[PDB]
Amino acid sequence: SQVRQNYHQDSEAAINRQINLELYASYVYLSMSYYFDRDDVALKNFAKYFLHQSHKERRHAEKLMKLQNQRGGRIFLQDIKKPDCDDWESGLNAMECALHLEKNVNQSLLELHKLATDKNDPHLCDFIETHYLNKQVKAIKKLGDHVTNLR
Amino acid sequence: SQVRQNYHQDSEAAINRQINLELYASYVYLSMSYYFDRDDVALKNFAKYFLHQSHKERRHAEKLMKLQNQRGGRIFLQDIKKPDCDDWESGLNAMECALHLEKNVNQSLLELHKLATDKNDPHLCDFIETHYLNKQVKAIKKLGDHVTNLR
Amino acid sequence: SQVRQNYHQDSEAAINRQINLELYASYVYLSMSYYFDRDDVALKNFAKYFLHQSHKERRHAEKLMKLQNQRGGRIFLQDIKKPDCDDWESGLNAMECALHLEKNVNQSLLELHKLATDKNDPHLCDFIETHYLNKQVKAIKKLGDHVTNLR
Amino acid sequence: SQVRQNYHQDSEAAINRQINLELYASYVYLSMSYYFDRDDVALKNFAKYFLHQSHKERRHAEKLMKLQNQRGGRIFLQDIKKPDCDDWESGLNAMECALHLEKNVNQSLLELHKLATDKNDPHLCDFIETHYLNKQVKAIKKLGDHVTNLR
C-alpha cells in the first residue's frame, strides 16, 4: 500500500484476529439478549442491557476494521462462530459468562499490545491503549459489581 | 411454551434459517463497505451506503428473533459464514453481487410464505408480507436502477 | 344491501358471534378489575390494568360492528353472559384466566380467517390479519411474561 | 368487611340490580347507534349521539361498582340481556324508546332512594341524589325536547 509505514505483517494478522473476536463477542451478547426475551424467562432489563452490549461490540469491530485500512493493511474476514450456549439459565450465569468473555478479550488485547511493543509500533500501541484497554478495565469492573450484587 | 398456538415446528425451523440468512447478508454488506474504504479504492459514497445496508440487515435479523419469541418458538443460532469474496472488484460488481444476494433472500422469504400458507398460519403470512416482501421488492428495484446507471 | 359484494352469509354470522365474544371478554375484564378494587384485596395496579383491558375489548367489539355495516351485513346482538367467577382468587390466577381467555379468542379469530379463506373473501382476511391477529399474539405474549414473573 | 358500617343487605342487593340495569341501558344505546350506522339508514348524528350515551351509561355502572366496594358490599354480576329490538325503525322511534328507558331507570333509582331512606342510610341517599337523580331529570327533559322537535 502507498500509505503503509512501520506496519509489520504480524500486526496486520493480529488485527484481523481481533476483528473476528469482537464480532464473536457481539454475537454472544445478541444470544443472551434474546434469551432474556423468552416468555418463560421475561427479564426485560437484562435483554435491553445485553442488546446494548452487542451493538457496542459491533462498533468496536468496525473501529478495528477502520484502523486496518488506515495503516494500509488488508482485511480478511472469517466465520463468526456460534456461541457456546443456547440457554443461559439465569441472569447471574449470563453475567458470569460475560465477565469470562471480557477477560478473554482483554487478554487478547494485551497480547496485541505486547506484539506492537516488540515491533516498535508506537501508533498501534497508543491506539490500543486509548480505544480498548481502559474500556475493557471499566467493563470488567462493572460486570464484577453486577455479579456481586446478583450473588 | 404457554403462549404457543398454531405454530408448526417446520415454521420454527424455517424462521431460524431465515435469521441466519439475514445475519449473513449483514456480514456481506459490512465486507463490501470496508472494501470501498481502502486507500487504493477510496469511494466514500459506496462505503457509507453498504454500511447502512449492513445495519439494516442486522435490524431485520433482530425482528425475526423477536417474532420467534413472540410465537413461542426457540431460537437456535448457527455460524455466520464468511462472504464469498474479500475483494469486490468495483462498484458495479459490488452492486451486481448485492442484487443477486437480495434476490436469493427474496426467494427464501417466498418459500417461507408458501410454508406458512401450507400450514394455515395467517399470522406468519401477514408478518412476512407486511415486514419483508415489499421491502425486498423495493430493494431489488433500487439495486437494479443503480446497476443500470453504473453500467 | 345495495353495498353488499362478495360477502357470504356464513361470514356475516361468524362476525356476529365474534362481536358477542369480544363483548364477553370486556365483561370478564371489568369483573377482574373490580375484584382487585375490594378492600380485602387492594391491588390498585391490577384494577387499573384490567379496567384498561375491558375498555380495549369494547373498542374491538365496536370495530367489528362497524365492519359488519361496511360490508352490508346486519348486526344481531345476543345476551352477554356473566363471567365464570365472582372471586378471582389472586393476581396470578387472574392473569392465568386472562391468558386462557385470550387464547380462546385467538382460536375463534383463526377459525374466522379459515372461513374467509374458504369463501374467497380477501378483504375480510386482510381485515382480520391487520386488526386482530398480531394484537392477539402480542397480548398473549405479554400475559405469558406477566404469568412467568408472578410465578 | 372491615369497612362495612350502616350498610344493609337489601341495599347491597339493590345496588347490584342497579349495576345490571345500567349495563343493560349501555347495551341498548350501542344497538341504537349501530342501527343508524347502516347504509340504508345513514344518519350520522344519531349514531354519534347514541354511542356517546352508551359510553355514559357504562361510566354510571362503573361508579355504582365503585360505591359497592366503598361501602364493603360484594359485587355479583348477571347476564346483560339483549335489547328488545334489532331494528329501531326511525330516529323518532329510537328517541321515544330512549325516553321510556330513562324513565324506567329513574323509577328504579327512586325505589332505591326509598329503600335507603327506610334503612336510615344517609350516605347512600346523598350518593343517589348527587350522582344520579338530577342527571336523570336532565336526560329525560332533553329526550322530551328531542321528541317534540322530531314530531
Added chain:
Amino acid sequence: SQVRQNYHQDSEAAINRQINLELYASYVYLSMSYYFDRDDVALKNFAKYFLHQSHKERRHAEKLMKLQNQRGGRIFLQDIKKPDCDDWESGLNAMECALHLEKNVNQSLLELHKLATDKNDPHLCDFIETHYLNKQVKAIKKLGDHVTNLR
C-alpha cells in the same frame, strides 16, 4: 427484466387492464363534475366532490403503473374510452352511477386477487389488499350512504 421474480405474465396483463380501468373511472368522474358545473344545473358541492374523486382515481392509476415497474413488468397503455353519458340527469342518478362503477372496479380487483392467489404471488396479493380493497369497501359504503340520503 433484471429485477423480475415470481411475476407471472398473466399478472402483468391484468395489471395493465386495471390501469386502463382506473383511468376510465377518473374520466367518468371528470365528466360528472363538469356536468354539475353547468349554469342550468349549478350544484357546486357535487362538482367539487366529483372533481376530487377524479383526481383520486388518477392517483390510483399512477400507483398501479409504479407497481408494474417495480415488479419488472412493462406498461402498455390503451385508449381511454369516453363515459357512457354526457348528461348525468341528477345528483341522485350520478351517485347511483358512481356506485355501479365502484362495484365494477371492486369486482375487477377481486378477480385480480384471485389470479395472484392462483399464481402464488403473495406480494401482489398484499399490494392489492393493502392499497385497493379496503379503500373500495369504504368508497362503496360512502356512496350507498349518499344514495340513501338523496333518495
Added chain:
Amino acid sequence: SQVRQNYHQDSEAAINRQINLELYASYVYLSMSYYFDRDDVALKNFAKYFLHQSHKERRHAEKLMKLQNQRGGRIFLQDIKKPDCDDWESGLNAMECALHLEKNVNQSLLELHKLATDKNDPHLCDFIETHYLNKQVKAIKKLGDHVTNLR
C-alpha cells in the same frame, strides 16, 4: 343557455376539440414519465419532469371545460387515444417528441384564435391569448433549450 351571448357554434365545437387535445397531451406525458421509471432506463429527473408536465396539461384541459360552461356551451367528451409509442428510446428522443407535440398544440390554438377573430368574439380571443399562447411559446422555448443541451 340563459347565459349564452356572442358564442358561435363553431367556437363551441373547436373548444371541445381542444379539450380532447389537451387530455391527449397529458396522456402522452404520463407515458413518457413512466418510461423513465423503468429499471433498465432509470432516469429519475426525466420521470419527475414529465409527470409534472402531465399534471399541467390536465389542468389546462380543466380550464377549457370551465370556459365552455362559462360561455353557455355544452361539453362533449371523446375517447383519449393512446400515445404513438410505448418505448421512448431516450431522453433526447422524448424531448424531441414533446417539442413536436407542443408545436402541434400551438398550431391548434392559433387556428382557434383565427376562428374566434373571424366570428368577432373578443372574449374568446383574449382568453386564448392570456391563458394559452404565451405559455405555449415559453414551453416551446424551454423544450428547444433542453434539446440543444441534450444534443
